[PDB]
């Protein structure tokens, strides 16, 4: 009934009704004009002919290793290239933010309420005749059927990029500081009001929780020693709320501060490592500043760990999953002469696309043993049993599964994969093709183009009937992967903008924060600028086992 | 004890301790180097001997009415000029913010906790030997003595720029959406979590309060009719809490939603005007959008009012108090090709300097009656008796007091002025001269240079003993005014940057927001772009009396 229900405005033009049956498109700053912002201005015509496809670019980034070897060692070209990826991605994100589940137009309520996930595309209106607006049937296909036909795993498909379990659990640990859906309110509500990398999954979302996790000497976090090893403190000792089955032994009720982290020993492995790391930095910082009190040591160490995280995320984690020969660089200075907003709001679609459960293996192989999901969940005695050094060595060696390419969601998390479909619809997401347009991709013309094969394509066609009505979540996991890659085109071209905006958006990247005094001087500053996944493990894990995100 | 107590680092360098008795200066990006960042880089040398003093620039702006008469008419020149005032002012403020009452170093708590006012200069550390750090006596001069000698009004001093009571009350009403001290918590803490121009003073800080004030029809705010005139609804009807003395007879307990606006009829006057204006705009939107529901009517009207507010503050309000012949311009597009952060945090010092109580008369003259403070306070009946038309006519006609120049604080609010001195010390403000360097002004070398006269200068010199220990607040009210001006140099050079960043940093000024469709189409947009103090009054006040911020 709403005249904007068909999504008539193209190229990021905004649609507004102008009567019960009529509409208008606002083409301001789009580079186009016309009734629907489809006829381009002269300069636009030119930018367009010059613009290479995401697929062409990706080819160039994953070939010619010899040329990249050179570029990488010419600091000024490396900086030039990295500047361009940074800015070209980030300009895809609305900032300040617009739209959320309840608002398909820009209200002060949508801007000011930090309780919502923001939304890259506005929700389909409540009165549209079909779930996707105007197209398709009255009803999307039964979600159980989609799940079973194209998502559930038959045989385990390994990631051809060699992503290991260190990678999979880092992703889960790092992302769960900003994906924290508030189930009391609905999907599309978050409990992580920091809307980014604030390390609340280490220090607690609220001051109350932080103070419970704190030792209040030397800036340190509370902990216990079992065997000769440092672990998070207990729930009984700190009185912080955690989520645990009621039968779990007092000693194994680890507290840590993201309340959900005790349900997977892999999460708790990183919780322990980061806890250890905070306290290691306190020691260095105390050594450097005998004058300092507890508050300042805690607060400075926290700023340093924020930097270390972003460093690692860009130069090891994103580096790995990109498959690029170009060496990505964490360097806030790249943006000091650019237009850039040091702020971030996490999008609901970013939560959605980050559901990478295909990464999970059939069993968890902690060198020697092989645990089933049932055995693994809410079970920290495994961590105690094997210790951190083992775990690192084991997780470094076990391949994770491929994410795109279809049929690789472990049955053990089927209920989760289904909820993603259901909550997507509940939140009234626009189609896959609407999202491809939003991010400057060409809409798919058939399911067979989406998957690159024929079997899954046909199953999808019988269910959806029209490609322009295919949904975002199912499509990301079923999409044709890049040649020997973990992800398809859509995952990368939507993921990258959200990701890099969240990373560089941080206040510690702003000119006023990005200087040595912010981090306790030159010493604290180097901890950030030399941080890596290897040194994180090396410094904090008993032996000094080798790791990477790659299974070698 | 703190080695940084002397504030050694100059030119915006940051001090850090490096041991119990030593310190280091971080000169990064200051344009200076050396132990205290006082030795300028070459390009910095050129900039300095090419930079006109604030007084030179002020002179140029307040003279040559002939030339400015030409420039105001070259859209091209007006723009580039306004662009330069916006950018150079704003670069003076840290954004993202740094420091608050409790943190004289960066910290994530200082960044993330919106309950604090930010701070342009960090507090003086608790353990410093003297209140100003290292200079002056172990104690600051008795605040009663400072108050009585150089602050209290003997004879009324009228503003030479001709400010009237429309100006004074506009000031109070507008600033009180972002200055809302949380007294429960302390000075340094605010209840305006929106940190800017969000119109919470019309709509409420929380969603619970907003809903209580809302009609839920046609997007409107609840109101009552008394005689044939529209007034805010009552406390008993809306259940929204207000602050009123118990003797107030319900029925005059107007709601309005900044809970403090009952205690001055001049505040209730504007509250009434903006409430009428909101419902007026709903009528206009409804006419353009027969198909819109209540929610979008409400939200769109709110965005439009925000726009009107910003427009009026810049082109009528700031315009008047500036005394410039150059015609200021509200135009977000001026910043689209510039680096600029669309975010704000209101500074404690901004609150401090806006304590413009000298504006207030000894009696409030509403055509025919001369009301005293005791009679004016929390007394809406005066508003009901005279009406909005009378009130605008009277307020437009009565002059305000001069602010700088000393000895013009109304005796009626002497307790308030004393609290300002006392709270500044409580919040550990740095000295006047520290704040002057921070905003690129020369430190004053004697009290006599500060005041421009002799008698107060000598009074101050006996109290403070040393000019480098003079306090900021008392100084602003005692400072030598610009020629026939309302304020002295310090007020303007501090206030302008806080004010302009506060205005332009609003999300509706950002590229994605600044477009016709945000405000419901070209007619909604035009309300923003044509708004003025005169038009605000003409549309909503019975007859349509002439108004101005200037006495005629
Ligand atoms: C043993 C490993 C894992 C288990 C047991 C698990 C299970 C779960 C469960 C029960 C949920 C909540 C679903 C809901 O509340 O609707 C969830 C959500 C989620 N998962 Fe996993 N998962 C695992 C691994 C991973 C991995 C490797 C990733 C990689 C990115 C990931 C990404 C996410 C995300 C982004 C959410 C949404 C979080 C939120 O909105 O609060 N998970 N998972
Ligand atoms: C009848 C008129 C006025 C009265 C009765 C009045 C009285 C007061 C009082 C009692 C306070 C609270 C003091 C405290 O908490 O220590 C205050 C604060 C303040 N006043 Fe006024 N004042 C008036 C007009 C004005 C005007 C015209 C301005 C112009 C800017 C102004 C600026 C301020 C500011 C910025 C604060 C701080 C508010 C906060 O932090 O919440 N006042 N005033
Ligand atoms: C030749 C490769 C070096 C430059 C690196 C650019 C990497 C990211 O470039 C991306 O590619 C897409 C298609 O071109 C665009 O849609 C994106 O906006 C752009 O950010
Ligand atoms: C510097 C040399 C430039 C050569 C660019 C090679 C581009 C070929 O790249 C091809 O583009 C397609 C995109 O639609 C993809 O489907 C293919 O997988 C990809 O190989
Ligand atoms: C992973 C186990 C759960 C899914 C089985 C039930 C749904 C049936 O799904 C079918 O499974 C076949 C075998 O893979 C495919 O050949 C078909 O294309 C597919 O539709
Ligand atoms: C284009 C020519 C520029 C010259 C403008 C005149 C500058 C005078 O500026 C002077 O600066 C002093 C600063 O302390 C003030 O005390 C004076 O009041 C002020 O007149
Ligand atoms: C006369 C030239 C056009 C008018 C623009 C200047 C008005 C505001 O510019 C101000 O001037 C001061 C002195 O240089 C600086 O200290 C301020 O930082 C700057 O914002
Ligand atoms: C969250 O999911 C992703 C997926 C791919 C990404 C790729 C980049 C880099 C390589 C990019 O192409 O600019 C960054 C973040 C990414 C995040
Ligand atoms: C709160 O106090 C002030 C005082 C002077 C101001 C001057 C400007 C303009 C004219 C300017 O000088 O840039 C803006 C805000 C201002 C605020
Ligand atoms: C100039 C132009 O392209 N106008 C099109 C119109 O033909 C179409 O009916 C409408 C609905 O999608 O979209 C628009
Ligand atoms: C959201 C948040 O953390 N608010 C905190 C509040 O809890 C605390 O009372 C205050 C003083 O420490 O700082 C602020
Ligand atoms: C939630 C929290 O820990 N905050 C505490 C709170 O008890 C106190 O009233 C407030 C006053 O500043 O700050 C502190
Ligand atoms: C509840 C559950 O599955 N228990 C497991 C158990 O099977 C396993 O022997 C142990 C290893 O430490 O981890 C726990
Ligand atoms: C190189 C230099 O200027 N050193 C100065 C020193 O002379 C002075 O005692 C001190 C004042 O704070 O600051 C430092
Ligand atoms: C701080 C704030 O306004 N939070 C609001 C909350 O009250 C409301 O429940 C929710 C959904 O309307 O939007 C959010
Ligand atoms: C989704 C959600 O939490 N909705 C809330 C509602 O529970 C509450 O009654 C109201 C009060 O502000 O705010 C809104
Ligand atoms: C308690 C008090 O001061 N009452 C005043 C009264 O003096 C004045 O006549 C009346 C009408 O405007 O306003 C009220
Ligand atoms: Cl990410
Ligand atoms: Cl202002």
UniProtKB/Swiss-Prot annotation, chains A, B:
Induction: By cytokines and mitogens.
UniProt PTM comment: S-nitrosylation by NOS2 (iNOS) activates enzyme activity. S-nitrosylation may take place on different Cys residues in addition to Cys-509.
Enzyme Commission designation: 1.14.99.1
Cofactor(s) essential for the protein: heme b
Phenotype caused by lack of the gene: Mutant mice exhibit defects in colonic mucosal wound repair.
Residues the record marks as carrying a glycan: 36, 113, 379
Residues in coiled coil: none
InterPro entries: EGF-like_dom, Haem_peroxidase_animal, Haem_peroxidase_sf, Haem_peroxidase_sf_animal, Oxylipin_biosynth_metab
Location of the active site: 176 (proton acceptor), 354 (for cyclooxygenase activity)
TM stretches of this protein: none
Keyword vocabulary terms for this entry: Acetylation, Dioxygenase, Disulfide bond, Endoplasmic reticulum, Fatty acid biosynthesis, Fatty acid metabolism, Glycoprotein, Heme, Iron, Lipid biosynthesis, Lipid metabolism, Membrane, Metal-binding, Microsome, Nucleus, Oxidoreductase, Peroxidase, Prostaglandin biosynthesis, Prostaglandin metabolism, S-nitrosylation, Signal
Family per record: Belongs to the prostaglandin G/H synthase family.
Protein name: Prostaglandin G/H synthase 2
Species of origin: Mus musculus (Mouse)
